[PDB]
Design a protein around this ligand. Structure first.
Ligand SMILES: [Mg+2]
Ligand SMILES: [Mg+2]
Ligand SMILES: [Mg+2]
Ligand SMILES: [Mg+2]
Length: 546
């Protein structure tokens, strides 16, 4: 009930990308509502909607010019309320974006503030007569921005932006700014939205002689926001986009008094390294270096999202390794990251795609599926910024991949057309028809996961077999004990597990409930095909099947 987010399966979808219901070339909210059968049939329990508010769309809607209105291409407030009730009617929660940190430079606030130094809005933003303030803050969009200050001629001052120059940061030293945020929060939670994603949350406050990240004042505002939300809407959820090193990420949980969830940005790049190295150490090492979190808090697990695969919070040598291994074409790189989709990153290997999803589904947290990864969609690194991982959902082999009946040249972005990942080979309609497709494998795997709340809520203990290609761990919650063991190598592997804490129990494999040999006191030999992942419930004799 209050910890509902711990059991969710989250689907990350952009309204503009999913389904065009009126055939103008752009996805929309009524189109999203018409596809809820597919979303429900996948097994997801919560939809995280990328920004859908008024925006010039120069950063995919994260440059908002009016927090209270939908963008015209996506529909009306009333379309959204129809969506919100329809999803709730199916037991599907909804999570929306709170772009706390900055607005479009076309927001009215900034258009007033830049005009007259005496407007009530002048201090809504962060102004400076010199562009050497905040010397120690890095530039995030290093491929586009020369500086976090740009000159505004109408204002006679520089203004601050952590992201693109058309996204001026809000000023959290202005108590009115903070009040505008809380009112945006109330405006949307009032409609019944279940969760808010706190975008770019480490960058709220700036301070001189400081890197302007993770400042105590920022954490202070979030404790206030948490208390504000808890006092007026029960059982909501705040989700922190904090891509920092593990110690700094865990602080966004405060002590139960800050953010309910945070993305597990530390683990995400190490999964790709472990797989490529065929060695579990990157995964187990980064988790050893990740402090524990408050009891009611939850990690959000993900493999990919609407952004590049970020390499900001990995070491320099790890970044180079990841570049050389996963981004050999330099067009695949963007800022400190890799602008590629999951299936291309994994060379369209079905066994690797399944392995990575099983890891996503069996580590401690709440898994996010990025729209279209459940059919193995590809990318288009020629599209520009991160557009190449945001192409329309691939419903069929028809014109426009069934996303629209519009003139194909009017689509907001073209579907994937490369010879391996073309929508003529990768589409929902094709995969629905074969029981072994990636989509049906995902449906079945999610269905099993939902019978086992241990995965969202239980503890974890890692094993240490001497075969370094094998990653094995125990999940426990209440009366349920799970053994997960998988092979990170593209070759067959053998490993021996010390399961002596569970002598006398039987590993029962969750896919077909097949009974493996009883755990004795001797080490337990498992044997793996390439990239094979096993999950077993350890069960006593009186609970074996058949
Ligand atoms: Mg449309
Ligand atoms: Mg800021
Ligand atoms: Mg180890
Ligand atoms: Mg393989």
């Amino acid at each position: 009930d209050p910890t509902w987010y711990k059991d969710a399966i989250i689907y990350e979808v952009g309204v503009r990308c999913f389904f065009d219901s009126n055939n103008d070339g752009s996805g929309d909210i009524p189109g999203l509502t018409a596809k809820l059968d597919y979303i429900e049939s996948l097994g997801v329990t919560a939809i995280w909607l990328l920004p859908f508010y008024a925006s010039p769309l120069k950063d995919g809607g994260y440059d908002i010019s009016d927090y209270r209105s939908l963008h015209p291409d996506f529909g009306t407030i009333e379309d959204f309320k129809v969506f919100l009730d329809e999803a709730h009617r199916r037991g599907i929660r909804v999570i929306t974006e709170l772009v706390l940190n900055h607005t479009s430079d076309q927001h009215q606030w900034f258009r007033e503030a830049r005009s007259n130094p005496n407007s009530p809005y002048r201090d809504y933003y962060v102004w400076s007569d010199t562009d050497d303030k905040y010397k120690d803050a890095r530039i995030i969009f290093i491929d586009t921005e020369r500086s976090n200050w740009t000159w505004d001629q109408e204002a006679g001052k520089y203004y601050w932006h952590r992201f693109f120059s058309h996204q001026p940061d809000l000023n959290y030293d202005n108590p009115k700014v903070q009040q505008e945020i809380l009112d945006i929060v109330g405006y949307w939670l009032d409609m019944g939205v279940d969760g808010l994603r706190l975008d770019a949350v480490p960058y709220l406050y700036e301070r001189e002689g400081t890197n302007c990240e993770n400042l105590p004042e920022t954490h202070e505002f979030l404790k206030k926001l948490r208390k504000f939300v808890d006092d007026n809407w029960p059982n909501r959820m705040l989700l922190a986009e904090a891509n920092q090193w593990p110690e700094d990420v865990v602080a966004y949980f405060g002590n139960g008094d800050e953010c309910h969830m945070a993305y597990h940005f530390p683990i995400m790049p190490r999964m790709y390294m472990a797989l490529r190295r065929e060695d579990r150490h990157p995964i187990t090492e980064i988790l050893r270096r990740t402090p524990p979190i408050p009891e009611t808090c939850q990690w959000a697990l993900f493999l990919r999202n609407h952004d590049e695969l970020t390499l900001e919070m990995v070491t320099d040598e790890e970044r180079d390794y990841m570049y050389h291994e996963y981004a050999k074409d330099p067009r695949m790189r963007l800022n400190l990251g890799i602008r590629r989709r999951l299936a291309p990153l994994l060379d369209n290997s079905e066994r690797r795609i399944q392995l990575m999803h099983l890891l996503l589904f069996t580590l401690p947290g709440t898994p996010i599926i990025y729209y279209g990864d459940e059919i193995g969609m590809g990318d288009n690194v020629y599209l520009g910024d991160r557009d190449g991982v945001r192409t329309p959902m691939q419903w069929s082999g028809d014109r426009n991949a069934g996303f629209s009946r519009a003139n194909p040249q009017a689509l907001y972005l073209p579907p994937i057309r490369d010879p391996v990942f073309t929508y003529e080979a990768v589409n929902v309609e094709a995969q629905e028809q074969v029981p072994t497709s990636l989509l049906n494998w995902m449906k079945r795997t999610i269905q099993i996961r939902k019978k086992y709340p241990v995965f969202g809520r239980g503890s974890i203990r890692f094993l240490q077999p001497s075969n370094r290609a094998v990653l094995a761990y125990i999940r426990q919650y209440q009366d349920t004990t799970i053994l997960c063991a998988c092979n990170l190598s593209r070759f067959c592997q053998a490993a021996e597990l010390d399961l002596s804490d569970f002598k006398g129990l039987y590993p029962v494999e969750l896919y077909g409930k097949t009974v493996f040999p009883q755990i004795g006191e001797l080490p337990y030999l498992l044997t793996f095909g390439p990239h094979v992942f096993y999950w077993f419930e350890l069960k006593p004799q009186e609970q074996l099947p058949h």
